[PDB]
Ligand binder design. Structure first.
Ligand SMILES: *[C@@H]1O[C@H](CO)[C@@H](O)[C@H](O)[C@H]1NC(C)=O
Ligand SMILES: OC[C@H]1NC[C@@H](O)[C@@H](O)[C@@H]1O
Ligand SMILES: [Zn+2]
Length: 1014
């Protein structure tokens, strides 16, 4: 295994290093506004060395943006694909590339058999070529790597089954900035090449000058380079035709033949395209070839890529004709005129890359190595696209919830083969597809129109319900005596209980377990642990009585704590935000211990009086002018008092101190250690009254944030043996700090209401001497070192915080883990900040045509980990990566993949069992079974189950960490006939494993295995 910590990779281009040196000056470079006047030696190409030009027709189809997926399909995409089939069929030399499989599958299944065959033929013959082949062209900032893989697999599995092809070249022309997580996944999925486009204009200029636009992109910790994937970065401002033929859009626009009038399109540079004729072809060719040769100066081979497309292009038959015929005339002339020394033709993306590597092998070009990422993107001036790191946070959080439900549903149902009547495969396909669709760069990014966001939400809601159905049917089968098991595949044996989604104050959705002497004495509940190691976690349920005791199936008492059910309300009368307690519902809390990838059953029983093993939390409401707060049967009376500073400690965990405003002030790790200053503060960013305005994409603050006026907020303190908390009703946010014995959990119920042109940020202020360094993660896969650059505007220093961020000095580190992707930064030494929500009244000129005014209450969750790191073996000062500690990693897992909770629906569960998976191996803490998916239906003689195994890298800080079993996923199911290592999509077998044993992976490595069972 490679050492991902102590060996700084030697690369030609390291993006953090490049950023430190670049000046980012935005000067007018001429026709190529953000570049320079490209010059070339006409004698460079000749009869013995010609410029090979591949014109690649394409159509950018967004699976939802200003219209929903279905609306676009009906109005544009079905016509684009129908006419592509006809035109390619009739013109053998014409080519076309396609990226979004969600649309292609929608189209294909509606085609008659005759057309399906014609379509398969033009794909088999190479005219229509799929690029990437994912369900969508995913966002690369907010997306979790697990979902990027999910959607890639969904699209490629469909392609293999129906088109019999697996793309090895990726095409990503629209994500707003790019992540190295893509080449990581692609390279492990059979890919050999990838193309990107949206990178900072300053980066394009810098790399272009050094002809480093094509490079071998390796991971920041990869010293050997085995993760490298050849990457092509487009050099210009856009992927449209005016910005893909050469440096001068005024000239290039003249070669987009759809801009003549009848199509309602024109050239903003004032010179329209002119139909090619024998009379003007020589002059037109001279202009075009000149542009091509200028573009070619920016690359190292004699093979040039010229994309030919734009948004939803190649729709009308007349459009196919005008583009094809005119280019055909140009090709005939150019290729016949030796003085040009050019051979141009329509081509596909794979053809371009194949030619490039042929030139490379011929020894005519050597490519530079590169590591790093391409955030934060700016397409012009100071317009940095960091706003979408937060836009529509409700759905960003929903993405993470569904991410987990899909994993849990696929894993729980994978243990058995199911009869087709159970509709398991059907429900799982639906769930995978709706979540995959949301990975689109206008989905999770929060950059779609209001009604489109609603469509995505509805789709994800249906997906969650599908997951619940599969999960509950699976639990019933896994924990019921076989000879008693009598399933009704439409019946709900269990109801899922989720305490953090939609969340308290967002939607009263969870059911109350109703117990009573005259109705029902007890209730069975079951917890699922999707992680491959034994896990304990506090779980809570709503019960109709405070007198409830918990037992495991062996009838062993389990210590429990009961707390009131508190709800916060904006009292329109008193004009205050205060909590009201329920007098009919209560929360029971207890520690559940669940087997690796297993289940554990518990029983809740009611009693007439306080049970021996259940304690009750005390409650203190701090504020002036208090009023009584009755809690029905709840044992202890609520206490009141004027606002004051308070300190709390649960178990042997840390001691937290809070200000009289209910905000964290300090953390004391041990009774001996000191009170480390850690202050939570909420501030607000505004919008400029002059110039460019912030919108769904852009973050253009009118200066540093201003503190939110808190006034004298109401603070609620709940103190319990198992769980304590401090909650405060601040303007726009009910802020809560929960303590359970370890790193606290933070929950923010964010309701920005009608606060227009406001972005709410949560900041942490500490004494950590971090300077200008901080770390943020990329797709929940790796942590990358960031350097605050004062030479760049505030918004440029904002980065995606898909799952976590941290700052540190020689001795101390503060890590903030998130349960949802949001934007954040460290604008000053010792600080960390993350945006909660943003409400913008205006559009930011990127085509959306609206601001962001559809905000809705969202419950953001986090874990705050303060640690001493002076003993940890960390990367050198020059290493571009950072790594989490065991505690921080486990805290992240507690947010993203918590235990699942099931409540038995009926009064009695006959044949109930107390546990499942007790014999499952408990793998080392840094290893995870990211995916467990049965790949075959019940009729298959040989069953196949696929697993995606990921091993992260945790810092060694002197903790023994021992006793763990080897995890061999290939033997998790009995009767294993073979074990094979496969690409991450499970589509290609890479190795036949002897002994049918799937070996564990190395740190920061991800592998896939498929076990076959007879
Ligand atoms: C799929 O393509 C391969 C070539 O890569 C070919 O050998 C095989 O017969 C094809 N399968 C079908 C009929 O779809
Ligand atoms: O300008 C941004 C916007 N342009 C049109 C579409 O491609 C959409 O996805 C994108 O966000
Ligand atoms: Zn797009």
């Amino acid at each position: 295994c490679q050492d991902v910590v102590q060996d700084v990779p030697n690369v030609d281009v390291q993006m953090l290093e490049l950023y430190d040196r670049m000046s980012f000056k935005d000067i007018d470079g001429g026709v190529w506004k953000q570049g320079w006047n490209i010059k070339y030696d006409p004698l460079k190409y000749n009869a013995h060395h010609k410029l090979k030009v591949f014109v690649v027709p394409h159509s950018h189809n967004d699976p939802g943006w200003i219209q929903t997926f279905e609306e676009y399909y009906q109005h544009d995409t079905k016509h684009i694909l129908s006419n592509a089939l006809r035109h390619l069929h009739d013109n053998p030399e014409m080519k076309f590339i396609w990226a979004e499989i969600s649309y292609f599958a929608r189209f294909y299944h509606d085609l008659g058999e005759n057309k399906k065959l014609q379509m398969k033929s033009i794909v088999k013959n190479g005219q229509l070529e799929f690029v990437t082949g994912g369900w969508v062209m995913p966002d690369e900032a907010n997306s979790h790597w697990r979902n990027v893989l999910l959607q890639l697999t969904e699209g490629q599995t469909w392609l293999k089954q129906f088109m019999n092809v697996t793309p090895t070249a990726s095409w990503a022309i629209d994500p707003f900035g790019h992540s190295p997580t893509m080449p990581y996944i692609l390279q492990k999925s059979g890919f050999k090449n990838m193309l990107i486009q949206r990178t900072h204009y300053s980066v394009k200029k810098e790399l272009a000058q050094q002809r480093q636009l094509e490079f071998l992109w390796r991971q920041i910790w990869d010293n050997k380079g085995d993760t490298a994937l050849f990457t092509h970065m487009m050099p210009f401002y856009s992927y449209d035709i005016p910005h893909t033929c050469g440096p001068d859009p005024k000239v290039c626009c003249q070669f987009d033949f759809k801009r003549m009038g009848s199509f309602g399109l024109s050239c903003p540079w004032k010179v329209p395209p002119r139909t090619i004729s024998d009379q003007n072809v020589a002059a037109r060719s001279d202009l075009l070839v000149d542009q091509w040769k200028k573009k070619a100066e920016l690359y190292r081979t004699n093979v040039l890529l010229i994309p030919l497309g734009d948004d939803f292009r190649f729709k009308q038959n007349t459009e196919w004709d005008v583009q094809r015929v005119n280019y055909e005339r140009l090709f005939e002339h150019i290729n016949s005129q030796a003085h040009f020394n050019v051979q141009a033709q329509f081509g596909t993306l794979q053809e371009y890359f194949d030619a490039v590597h042929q030139a490379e092998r011929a020894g005519q070009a050597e490519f530079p190595t590169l590591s790093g990422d391409f955030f934060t993107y700016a397409d012009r001036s100071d317009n940095y696209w960091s706003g979408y790191y937060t836009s529509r946070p409700y759905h960003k959080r929903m993405d993470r919830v569904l991410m987990h439900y899909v994993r849990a549903a696929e894993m729980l149902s994978a243990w058995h083969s199911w009869d087709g009547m159970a509709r398991i495969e059907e429900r799982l396909e639906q769930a995978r597809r709706e979540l995959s669709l949301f990975q689109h760069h206008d989905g999770i990014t929060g950059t779609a129109k209001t009604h489109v966001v609603v469509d995505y939400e509805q789709r994800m809601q249906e997906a969650l319900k599908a997951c619940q159905m599969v999960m509950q049917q699976s639990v019933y089968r896994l924990l019921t005596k076989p000879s008693i098991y009598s399933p009704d595949f439409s019946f709900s044996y269990f109801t899922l209980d989720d305490s953090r989604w939609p969340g308290s104050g967002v939607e009263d959705s969870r059911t109350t377990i109703i117990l009573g002497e005259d109705i029902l004495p007890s209730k069975h509940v079951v917890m699922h642990n999707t992680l491959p190691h034994w896990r304990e976690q506090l779980v809570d349920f709503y019960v109709s009585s405070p007198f409830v005791s918990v037992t495991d199936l062996a009838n062993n008492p389990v210590e429990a704590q009961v707390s009131p059910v508190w709800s916060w309300h904006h009292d329109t009368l008193t004009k205050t935000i205060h909590p009201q307690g329920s007098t009919t519902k209560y929360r029971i809390i207890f520690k559940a211990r669940v087997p690796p990838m297993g289940l554990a059953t518990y029983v809740l029983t009611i009693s007439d009086s306080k049970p021996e093993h259940t304690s009750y939390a005390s409650n203190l409401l701090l504020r002036k002018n208090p009023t009584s707060l009755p809690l029905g049967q709840y044992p202890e009376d609520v206490k009141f008092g004027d606002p004051r500073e308070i300190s709390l400690r649960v178990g042997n965990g840390p001691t937290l101190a809070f200000s009289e405003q209910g905000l964290l002030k300090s953390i004391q790790l041990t009774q001996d250690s000191p009170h480390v200053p850690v202050h939570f503060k909420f501030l607000k960013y505004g919008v400029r009254s002059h110039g460019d305005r912030s919108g769904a994409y852009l973050f253009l603050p009118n200066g540093p944030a201003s503190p939110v006026e808190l006034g004298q907020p109401v603070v609620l303190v709940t103190k319990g043996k198992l769980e304590s908390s401090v909650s405060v009703g601040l303007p726009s946010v009910v802020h809560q700090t929960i303590m359970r014995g370890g790193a606290p959990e933070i929950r923010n119920l964010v309701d920005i209401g009608s606060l227009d042109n406001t972005e709410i940020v949560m900041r942490l202020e500490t004494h950590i001497d971090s300077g200008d360094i901080f770390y943020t993660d990329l797709n929940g896969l790796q942590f990358i070192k960031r350097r605050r650059l004062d030479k760049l505007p505030l918004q440029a220093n904002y980065y995606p915080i898909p799952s976590g961020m941290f700052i540190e000095d020689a001795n101390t580190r503060l890590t903030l883990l998130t349960g949802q992707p949001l934007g954040g930064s460290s604008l000053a030494s010792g600080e960390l900040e993350i945006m909660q929500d943003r409400r913008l009244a205006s559009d930011d000129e990127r085509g959306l045509g609206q601001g962001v005014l559809d905000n809705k209450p969202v419950l953001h969750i986090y874990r705050l980990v303060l640690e001493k790191v002076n003993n940890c073996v960390r990367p050198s000062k020059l290493h571009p990566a950072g790594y989490l500690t065991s505690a921080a990693h486990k805290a992240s897992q507690s947010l993203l993949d918590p235990l699942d909770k099931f409540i038995f629906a009926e009064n009695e569960w006959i044949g109930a069992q107390g546990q499942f998976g007790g014999d499952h191996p408990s793998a080392r803490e840094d290893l995870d079974v990211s995916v467990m998916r049965r790949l075959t239906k019940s009729s298959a003689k040989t069953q196949r189950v696929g697993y995606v195994l990921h091993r992260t890298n945790l810092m060694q800080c002197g903790t023994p960490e021992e006793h763990t079993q080897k995890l061999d996923v290939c033997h998790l199911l009995p009767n294993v006939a073979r074990c094979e290592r496969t690409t991450l999509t499970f589509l290609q077998n890479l190795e036949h494993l002897d002994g049918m044993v799937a070996p564990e992976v190395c740190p920061m490595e991800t592998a896939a295995y498929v076990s076959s069972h007879s």
